[PDB]
Amino acid sequence: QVYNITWEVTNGDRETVWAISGNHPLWTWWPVLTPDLCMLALSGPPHWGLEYQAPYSSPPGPPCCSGSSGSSAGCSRDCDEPLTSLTPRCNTAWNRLKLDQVTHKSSEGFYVCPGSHRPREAKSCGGPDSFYCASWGCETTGRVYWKPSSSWDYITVDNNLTTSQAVQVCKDNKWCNPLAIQFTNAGKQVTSWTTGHYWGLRLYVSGRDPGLTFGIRLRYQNL
Amino acid sequence: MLRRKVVCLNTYDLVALGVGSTLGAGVYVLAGAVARENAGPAIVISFLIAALASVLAGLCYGEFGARVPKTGSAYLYSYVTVGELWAFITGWNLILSYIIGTSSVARAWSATFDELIGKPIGEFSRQHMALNAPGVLAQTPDIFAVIIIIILTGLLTLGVKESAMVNKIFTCINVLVLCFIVVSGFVKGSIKNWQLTEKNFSCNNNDTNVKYGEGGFMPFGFSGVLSGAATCFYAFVGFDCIATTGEEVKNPQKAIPVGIVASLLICFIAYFGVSAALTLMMPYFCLDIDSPLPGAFKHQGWEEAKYAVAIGSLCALSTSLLGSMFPMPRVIYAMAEDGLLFKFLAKINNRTKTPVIATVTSGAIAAVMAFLFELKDLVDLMSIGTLLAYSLVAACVLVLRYQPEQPEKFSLKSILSPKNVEPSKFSGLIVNISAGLLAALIITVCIVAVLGREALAEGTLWAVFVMTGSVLLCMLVTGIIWRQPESKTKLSFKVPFVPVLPVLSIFVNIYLMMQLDQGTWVRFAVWMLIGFTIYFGYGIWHSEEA
Numbered sequence: 001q002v003y004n005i006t007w008e009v010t011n012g013d014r015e016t017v018w019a020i021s022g023n024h025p026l027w028t029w030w031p032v033l034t035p036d037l038c039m040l041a042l043s044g045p046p047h048w049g050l051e052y053q054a055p056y057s058s059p060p061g062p063p064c065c066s067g068s069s070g071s072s073a074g075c076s077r078d079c080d081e082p083l084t085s086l087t088p089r090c091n092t093a094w095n096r097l098k099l100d101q102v103t104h105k106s107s108e109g110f111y112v113c114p115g116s117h118r119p120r121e122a123k124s125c126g127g128p129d130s131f132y133c134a135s136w137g138c139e140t141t142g143r144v145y146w147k148p149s150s151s152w153d154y155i156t157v158d159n160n161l162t163t164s165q166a167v168q169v170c171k172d173n174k175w176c177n178p179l180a181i182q183f184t185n186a187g188k189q190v191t192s193w194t195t196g197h198y199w200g201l202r203l204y205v206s207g208r209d210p211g212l213t214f215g216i217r218l219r220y221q222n223l
Numbered sequence: 224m225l226r227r228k229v230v231c232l233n234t235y236d237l238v239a240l241g242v243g244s245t246l247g248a249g250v251y252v253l254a255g256a257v258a259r260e261n262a263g264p265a266i267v268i269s270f271l272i273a274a275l276a277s278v279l280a281g282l283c284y285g286e287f288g289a290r291v292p293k294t295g296s297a298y299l300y301s302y303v304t305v306g307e308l309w310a311f312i313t314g315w316n317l318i319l320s321y322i323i324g325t326s327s328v329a330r331a332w333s334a335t336f337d338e339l340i341g342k343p344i345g346e347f348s349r350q351h352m353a354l355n356a357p358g359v360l361a362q363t364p365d366i367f368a369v370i371i372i373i374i375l376t377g378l379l380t381l382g383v384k385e386s387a388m389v390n391k392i393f394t395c396i397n398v399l400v401l402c403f404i405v406v407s408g409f410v411k412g413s414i415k416n417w418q419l420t421e422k423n424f425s426c427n428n429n430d431t432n433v434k435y436g437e438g439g440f441m442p443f444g445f446s447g448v449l450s451g452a453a454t455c456f457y458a459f460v461g462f463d464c465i466a467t468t469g470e471e472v473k474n475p476q477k478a479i480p481v482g483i484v485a486s487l488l489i490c491f492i493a494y495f496g497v498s499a500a501l502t503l504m505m506p507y508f509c510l511d512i513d514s515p516l517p518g519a520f521k522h523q524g525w526e527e528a529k530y531a532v533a534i535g536s537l538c539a540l541s542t543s544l545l546g547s548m549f550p551m552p553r554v555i556y557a558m559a560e561d562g563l564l565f566k567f568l569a570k571i572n573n574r575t576k577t578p579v580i581a582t583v584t585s586g587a588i589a590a591v592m593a594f595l596f597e598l599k600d601l602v603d604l605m606s607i608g609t610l611l612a613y614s615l616v617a618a619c620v621l622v623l624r625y626q627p628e629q630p631e632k633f634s635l636k637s638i639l640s641p642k643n644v645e646p647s648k649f650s651g652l653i654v655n656i657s658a659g660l661l662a663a664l665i666i667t668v669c670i671v672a673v674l675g676r677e678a679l680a681e682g683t684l685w686a687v688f689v690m691t692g693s694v695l696l697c698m699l700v701t702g703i704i705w706r707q708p709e710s711k712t713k714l715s716f717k718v719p720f721v722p723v724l725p726v727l728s729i730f731v732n733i734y735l736m737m738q739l740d741q742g743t744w745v746r747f748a749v750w751m752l753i754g755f756t757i758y759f760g761y762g763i764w765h766s767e768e769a
């Protein structure tokens with residue numbers, strides 16, 4: 001029968017940061033989850049600058065003077081200045097622009113590795129602190145030149161908006177790093193989503209490759 | 224092209240002269256601009272690099288003046304030691320340095336004075352003047368800077384000279400004001416301003432188009448810090464006056480290097496303290512565009528202190544201004560008397576007994592530059608000129624150490640393992656060639672590290688290959704210079720590590736020059752084109768040694 005189904009995307013602390021809902025039979029609705037990469041970082045690792053931000057909180061940082069709202073008191077011109085020195089993070093609009101550039105540059109990007117649902121043979125992939133990406137080959141999906149894929153991983157993660165579509169959204173001081181998560185055939189065949197399955201996401205940059213941990217779970221009720 | 228010429232005050236007096244001629248617009252006006260635009264709280268680091276780059280240069284001067292019994296500007300030393308073309312380039316760069324320094328300091332003094340009285344002169348300028356070319360010219364011409372330059376040029380023409388007592392008094396007042404600024408920053412200022420985040424990216428004033436950057440201590444990154452250091456090299460200029468003192472010194476060549484180094488160290492300490500105070504009292508982004516230090520004092524509630532600072536700055540900006548003007552006619556007169564420049568510039572007026580025409584021409588050029596170009600543009604132009612001059616001095620120090628005492632085919636064994644105990648003409652030629660190749664290779668290294676910075680970060684094969692080859696071949700050429708014997712001539716002062724320290728000085732100077740803007744490079748290129756035209760059309764044929 002039909003239930004009110006709800007797919008939830010939660011941060012590393014297992015607090016729901018994004019959600020979508022619909023009336024469907026159980027295990028028949030597999031929508032494209034579009035959480036913001038910054039939403040996953042809310043109350044997350046210190047690098048993203050959102051370790052003290054609650055879920056569903058508004059994007060921090062002053063607006064860009066180039067935004068649709070125009071110039072205002074204390075508006076920032078960093079969104080027009082070069083993004084070279086900027087660190088890819090989510091605490092300001094220009095930092096979000098830098099994060100978008102990093103995730104959209106061919107030589108750079110982000111890669112995702114699976115968590116507790118990975119096979120025992122991958123147990124050498126590290127713990128949550130390592131983001132389950134202790135070494136190359138553990139990654140199962142992500143947007144990067146080597147284009148990783150897995151025949152058993154339950155999701156594939158890519159960039160939802162192209163750079164051009166996202167620059168203006170960033171300059172409007174909105175969440176402007178929307179991921180695109182698509183359930184694989186293996187994921188569609190899986191039923192344990194009620195308990196939640198968790199992945200780690202790390203940026204491919206020249207340095208620490210800082211990352212975070214996110215999760216996808218299912219809730220449902222009668223409708 | 225390579226024709227060569229035939230050649231009291233205590234150390235504390237030299238230190239006072241250097242400090243008075245160095246402290247000025249760099250700290251009172253430009254420190255806030257650098258801490259707001261290029262660097263943040265990390266401007267303290269920016270000065271440090273700018274200090275070291277200066278010290279490396281100053282040390283060279285100590286040796287570069289030790290090889291000439293006569294005391295004079297770097298132009299005289301070059302024209303006595305290396306050659307005519309090299310000396311002309313050095314003197315032309317010094318002329319640019321002095322002229323643009325006069326222009327920039329006159330502008331800073333005019334802006335400070337106009338601020339002190341409510342910007343009435345600026346209001347008149349906006350009302351009645353406009354250049355209609357913000358892309359390359361100033362938003363508002365500085366008529367008062369022109370007036371100041373005219374008055375000071377008139378004073379200089381009528382025989383006004385350096386008053387040591389007045390310089391000491393003004394330097395003491397400025398140093399007292401700077402110490403007060405440091406103490407007030409350490410008292411009122413807080414470390415939290417060095418740890419700002421997006422929570423604090425707001426200004427009480429409702430100015431727009433702010434650059435907040437990353438925040439914290441290094442909002443704009445190490446690239447921003449390096450650009451700030453290149454700009455802050457403006458502040459450390461002015462120690463050449465110690466080498467060009469002219470007046471008799473207790474130690475002809477031992478006190479001069481000590482005085483230069485002590486002045487540079489004192490200036491670095493003062494700049495570090497004042498910049499730390501400025502960035503601790505007020506947020507780096509909040510720093511007032513018109514007057515950073517008074518704005519920070521007002522932000523902390525000590526508005527009255529704006530008077531004290533006004534007393535200090537106007538003193539420093541005065542001592543610095545003359546420090547950039549008194550040498551200005553001297554270099555032009557020296558070059559003209561030698562025939563490199565137009566001979567009419569060397570005619571000394573009988574009534575005044577001074578080079579009236581050279582002083583008037585230099586003053587007019589400085590007044591026009593101050594009228595037409597912004598403070599930052601003139602600052603960068605003088606910085607590039609002075610950096611090239613200092614690199615030339617360092618190259619002279621590197622070269623002369625291995626040349627034989629004056630009155631082609633080669634072999635690998637001779638080049639790498641010379642057996643002569645003292646330099647020969649072959650060794651001197653090897654060192655000259657190695658210096659040229661090392662200069663070219665350092666230019667290549669800096670170009671790839673600046674222009675190809677992102678490419679190097681990306682790891683592209685061509686950029687990495689070029690950088691690696693250039694750096695390793697720089698090391699190889701430095702070793703080649705190392706193996707050559709040094710001149711046995713005894714010198715009162717020597718650069719300790721002559722094979723490395725001059726090379727590092729050249730590299731740092733060229734890197735800082737690369738940090739500058741494209742417009743600065745275009746202005747410098749046109750100035751150098753004018754200088755080369757003058758030399759090759761007039762200088763070579765009318766030289767006094769011809």
Ligand SMILES: *[C@@H]1O[C@H](CO[C@@H]2O[C@@H](C)[C@@H](O)[C@@H](O)[C@@H]2O)[C@@H](O[C@@H]2O[C@H](CO)[C@@H](O[C@@H]3O[C@H](CO)[C@@H](O)[C@H](O[C@H]4O[C@H](CO)[C@@H](O)[C@H](O)[C@@H]4O)[C@@H]3O)[C@H](O)[C@H]2NC(C)=O)[C@H](O)[C@H]1NC(C)=O
Nearest residue numbers: 004005006008018019020021022023056219220221222223
């Ligand atoms: C089908 O189910 C969805 C989702 O169910 C929700 O999650 C379940 C796990 C369970 O806890 C349910 O109780 C819960 O409702 C329903 O959509 C939710 O509807 C409620 C209201 O009925 C929303 O509650 C909140 O109410 C606040 C005011 O009191 C309001 O400010 C909230 O908006 C803000 O917060 C939400 C997240 O809470 C955020 O998504 C918004 O964008 C906004 O910031 C919100 O309205 C829930 O938020 C709704 N969604 C979720 C994921 O909880 C849906 O109504 C239901 N439909 C039927 C026909 O049954």
Ligand SMILES: *[C@@H]1O[C@H](CO)[C@@H](O[C@@H]2O[C@H](CO)[C@@H](O[C@@H]3O[C@H](CO)[C@@H](O)[C@H](O)[C@@H]3O)[C@H](O)[C@H]2NC(C)=O)[C@H](O)[C@H]1NC(C)=O
Nearest residue numbers: 032033034035036159160161162165175176177178179180
């Ligand atoms: C993530 O990617 C999806 C897919 O590209 C985006 O969904 C798209 O959003 C745009 C803008 O809302 C939709 O355009 C609209 O189309 C309708 C007709 O369907 C038209 O009437 C509207 O005027 C508007 O042009 C587009 O249809 C929609 N596409 C899909 C497949 O859903 C989404 O916006 C991206 N961002 C996020 C946060 O999900």
Ligand SMILES: CC(C)CCC[C@@H](C)[C@H]1CC[C@H]2[C@@H]3CC=C4C[C@@H](OC(=O)CCC(=O)O)CC[C@]4(C)[C@H]3CC[C@]12C
Nearest residue numbers: 243371374384385386387389390393541542544545546
């Ligand atoms: C109607 C106009 C003239 C009003 C504008 C104010 C003037 C009275 C100002 C503008 C420039 C000032 C001068 C700028 C610099 C100096 C140098 C200063 O001397 C030093 O600092 C000596 C240091 C050294 O010799 O190295 C003495 C004051 C003086 C002449 C100032 C005197 C007052 C002047 C002429």
Ligand SMILES: CC(C)CCC[C@@H](C)[C@H]1CC[C@H]2[C@@H]3CC=C4C[C@@H](OC(=O)CCC(=O)O)CC[C@]4(C)[C@H]3CC[C@]12C
Nearest residue numbers: 272275276278279445446449672676727728730731734
């Ligand atoms: C006075 C004597 C006793 C010591 C002289 C030491 C100097 C030769 C050293 C001290 C600090 C050094 C500088 C420290 C940092 C840099 C930055 C470096 O460039 C980068 O690291 C760029 C990185 C980026 O691309 O962001 C180029 C050399 C330079 C200027 C160094 C040049 C050599 C310096 C001036």
Ligand SMILES: *[C@@H]1O[C@H](CO)[C@@H](O[C@@H]2O[C@H](CO)[C@@H](O)[C@H](O)[C@H]2NC(C)=O)[C@H](O)[C@H]1NC(C)=O
Nearest residue numbers: 413414415416417418419420421422423424506
């Ligand atoms: C920058 O902003 C932060 C957060 O607003 C300030 O930190 C808090 O300030 C409040 C006062 O407004 C104090 O009560 C808290 O104890 C501070 N710390 C917290 C909340 O962790 C900080 O003071 C601001 N800094 C500056 C220089 O303005």
Ligand SMILES: *[C@@H]1O[C@H](CO)[C@@H](O)[C@H](O)[C@H]1NC(C)=O
Nearest residue numbers: 072073074426427428429430
């Ligand atoms: C802030 O803006 C108001 C007008 O909205 C203006 O009156 C005020 O002077 C501004 N604050 C300044 C200039 O410090």
Ligand SMILES: NC(=[NH2+])NCCC[C@H](N)C(=O)O
Nearest residue numbers: 247248249320324458460547
């Ligand atoms: N001798 C010079 N060229 N000096 C020009 C002025 C630079 C001086 N260091 C200042 O702080 O303003």
